[PDB]
Swiss-Prot record, chain B:
Biased amino acid composition, Basic residues: 107-117
Record-annotated disulphide pairs: none
GO cellular component, one term: small ribosomal subunit
Entries under CDD domains matching the protein: Ribosomal_S12 (cd03368)
Subunit structure: Part of the 30S ribosomal subunit. Contacts proteins S8 and S17. May interact with IF1 in the 30S initiation complex.
Provenance organism: Mycolicibacterium smegmatis (strain ATCC 700084 / mc(2)155) (Mycobacterium smegmatis)
Keyword Ribosomal protein included in the entry's annotation: yes
Family: Belongs to the universal ribosomal protein uS12 family.
Protein name from the UniProt record: Small ribosomal subunit protein uS12
One GO BP annotation of this record: translation
Swiss-Prot record, chain C:
Function: One of the primary rRNA binding proteins, it binds specifically to the 5'-end of 16S ribosomal RNA.
Residues of the full protein shown: 50 to 97 of 98
Organism: Mycolicibacterium smegmatis (strain ATCC 700084 / mc(2)155) (Mycobacterium smegmatis)
Cross-link (Isoglutamyl lysine isopeptide (Lys-Gln) (interchain with Q-Cter in protein Pup)): K47
Identification of the protein by name: Small ribosomal subunit protein uS17
Family: Belongs to the universal ribosomal protein uS17 family.
Assembly information from the UniProt record: Part of the 30S ribosomal subunit.
From Swiss-Prot, chain D:
NCBIfam families: PRK00136.1 (NF001109)
Function comment: One of the primary rRNA binding proteins, it binds directly to 16S rRNA central domain where it helps coordinate assembly of the platform of the 30S subunit.
Stated name of the protein: Small ribosomal subunit protein uS8
SUPFAM superfamilies tied to this protein: Ribosomal protein S8
Recorded name of the encoding gene: rpsH
The keyword rRNA-binding appears for this protein: yes
Domain of life assignment: Bacteria
GO terms for MF: rRNA binding; structural constituent of ribosome
Record-stated family: Belongs to the universal ribosomal protein uS8 family.
GO cellular component terms attached to this protein's record: ribonucleoprotein complex; ribosome
Organism this protein belongs to: Mycolicibacterium smegmatis (strain ATCC 700084 / mc(2)155) (Mycobacterium smegmatis)
Keywords: Ribonucleoprotein, Ribosomal protein, RNA-binding, rRNA-binding
Amino acid sequence: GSVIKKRRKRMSKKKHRKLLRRTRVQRRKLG
Amino acid sequence: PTIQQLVRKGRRDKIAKVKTAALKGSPQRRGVCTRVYTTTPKKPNSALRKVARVKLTSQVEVTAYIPGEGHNLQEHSMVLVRGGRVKDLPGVRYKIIRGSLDTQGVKNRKQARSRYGAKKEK
Amino acid sequence: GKIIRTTKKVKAHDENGEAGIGDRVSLMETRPLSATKRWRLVEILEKA
Amino acid sequence: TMTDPIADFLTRLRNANSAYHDEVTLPHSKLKANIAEILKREGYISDYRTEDARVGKSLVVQLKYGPSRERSIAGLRRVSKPGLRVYAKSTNLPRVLGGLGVAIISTSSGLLTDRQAARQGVGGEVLAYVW
RNA sequence: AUCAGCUUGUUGGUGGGGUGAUGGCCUACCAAGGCGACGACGGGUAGCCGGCCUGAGAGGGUGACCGGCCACACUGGGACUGAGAUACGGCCCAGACUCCUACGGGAGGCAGCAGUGGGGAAUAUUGCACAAUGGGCGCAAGCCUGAUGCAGCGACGCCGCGUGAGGGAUGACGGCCUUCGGGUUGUAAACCUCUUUCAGCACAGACGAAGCGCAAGUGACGGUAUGUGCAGAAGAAGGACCGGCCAACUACGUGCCAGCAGCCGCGGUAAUACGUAGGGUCCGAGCGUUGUCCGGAAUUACUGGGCGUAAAGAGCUCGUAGGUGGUUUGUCGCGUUGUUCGUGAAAACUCACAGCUUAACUGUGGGCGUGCGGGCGAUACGGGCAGACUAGAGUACUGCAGGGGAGACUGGAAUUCCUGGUGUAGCGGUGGAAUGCGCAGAUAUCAGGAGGAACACCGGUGGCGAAGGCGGGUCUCUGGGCAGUAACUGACGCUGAGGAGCGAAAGCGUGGGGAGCGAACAGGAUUAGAUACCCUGGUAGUCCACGCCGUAAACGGUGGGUACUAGGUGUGGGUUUCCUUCCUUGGGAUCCGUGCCGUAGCUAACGCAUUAAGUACCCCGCCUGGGGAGUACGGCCGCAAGG
RNA sequence: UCGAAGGUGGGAUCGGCGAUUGGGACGAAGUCGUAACAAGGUAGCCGUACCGGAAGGUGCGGCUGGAUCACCUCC
């Protein structure tokens, strides 16, 4: 299989992890 | 799968996507023209498509396409809307019926008149 | 089309209660003796 | 483990047939011997016999090939299998190859073919198809 | 189940009560049960069926008319009367709403038939008669019946008929195209005969009524259907489409506009795709569009699909419920199978016949009603019961190979540091340099000491382990495998939803340790810029103890068990016959592994191919176009990261 | 006694709005960079951790779905 699919999945995962890191304290305080 | 797997879980059919959810099970709906304007199609084509914003009786705000050459629609105009997709416009799934309620049949049409609400010449 | 084995619980009535747990018994239907009680113990087929 | 001896017999027959073997050996049982009898009487195999093995008895089946080395069996399928078993009434008996094949049916009168069962008006379990 | 617990008259007993009747139906006492992953308890949606539509069938969708059952009658309770009560046009109470009132109080219930307003895309007359059928009362005549029989309106549907028929030409006019010749409309028209369906006019005029009535009469439909005369082709055709799918092409106008479009896609001054005209095709009192369902779709695959690389094998095991199960004897007749009886309303469907002028439609007689219940028959297979056997499975005994695991102790090389000699001016690093170290004595060399981590050669596509993974040596404890004998048990097997356990690295907690390496972080360099690659330093971490986490390209991208299907050649473990020196991979045979090459076969191909991705059987997991997204929400687990 | 409606109370559950705020999809021509595909010019990807305007960089372990190995003298 082409690595293009892995690249799309990894970019989605990386962006989501960045978003989670950017709002850790906000999530902790709202939950 | 195994027959036992089938008798344990069975087969679940694919779900059906509801089309033209604003009509609510009716062939047509009556609406009022929220705003009447023009807009441009997708990139491969180019024109000034005539599109109206209609508030239906199902309390759904819907954008509808006006077929034919010329139209006389303005604000607060009662129109009768039907289902139909326009490939160029991204999210337009409805068309205004010509010759019904306020919207008028087009002028000087002699072929496919019934599709544009033009009466036969006397 | 596969043959399926299914299980069901009924409540029977025996006066003296000679039937323990695990005994193969015989039952016959009858009129409602209470709520949910609709069977009558005929006799104990084999004890266990 | 071994679940279907009949299916194993049918697959031994099929594998030997595809490899043009003239002989196939398998452990013996009454059911296997009876379907072997039906196969021989219907002309699908040459002949069969039972020897004695180290523990029990064996089944020896001779495969029939034509003069030009063409197989006398075109297919062997197991219909009723453990799990999903198949029973047919005397009226809805299956047809194999539009009647050109033979369907083995286990009736209370023994092992019969579809035509025999239809003539005698009995049903049973559809063991296999031969064509 | 992004709803796992629910139940206290709740489960059972006894005595009473109650009822037409059994019964926690009610009650007192007694006992503590009952239901639930075969999904209780919740949430959503829904009148059910004969049937109807679709489909080759299986199946999918649906419950309009007609027919059966159910529930309700402004909303919510309640009884009364009665043989019988959700009591639609009954009662009592409460409530909302509408109306009358002298203010004290009263009245009402179209989801009966018409009708009105409103909602909506959208659905009809405030009609005629009890003549026929059914019903109530009456001895009866008779009375009542918006049930019913009819009529009115709506192409709303199905069916049928008409708008004419025959003849008519080097083929009129006109239109359109043109190569300017002519061609097409076109036998079409005009004209000459013929017939008049249905409409129009006149006359006659029903059956439905072996009925009702002891009166003399009695048909709502209806003076309708129908029949017979009269006149005259006379009063009667539109819609969609024509690039391909998919029958049917030219001209003019316009030009990325105006527009078309179900998809592919057509509009850029010469468009068979836009608009209009000729021509054509398909249908025809219809023709198109929209909405909804089935088909095509084998696209949820029981019939009838898949999972190496296209979406799809859980990271791996153990094991619960369940599913499934070797050879053989007897028995049962549960499944299975044959026959018979009852039932499966009518209608519908299908076959045949009959009646409407035909058809739709109607009737009659079969079939169907794929099912269930009772009797009787069979025992091949499945199952149960009672046995038997040893080929599966396990044990025993004798050998064998191994980095399998845990603990303790311990060895040497090397790196670093510290101390002491010798010893000088550079060392270090790179593609090239600079930061950096050294001149306070560095690097180099020698001796001594401290500490931590990893174990060169052996050492490989070789061994072991379920997988992750596992090699310095020794000792202790411990798991599995294989071979031979076949002594023992006698199907004890396989798989396994959930569940439990193990599970690289990174990471987390507490306490130690810290030589080398080294995220982060500092400088140096390169560069247009270097939050990098390169250099010099360097903290967590890497290590140990005890616990968390629970993921990986956890891959052979290949779940487990079993049987069968050409061979050739390496290599690991073990038993054995023959060349025999018996030294020797001598060679063979056999059992268990691990590679390569290759048939048949399979696959879209690549490839797989006895270690299958071949041929089959049993069980499990998973897939259903791509994004959104393994994300949000809810939940569970976790210290957190997060899963 | 039971008992509709009504009243009081504390919770369940389903939705709408919400100042502000997060990400997603699409958009010929805007700005910043070159990350991937040829060894894509530091092989790529997987889990994890840290860091950075951004693609991304680095450490640790893993995978091949990674390219090239000329000449190579004895036989």
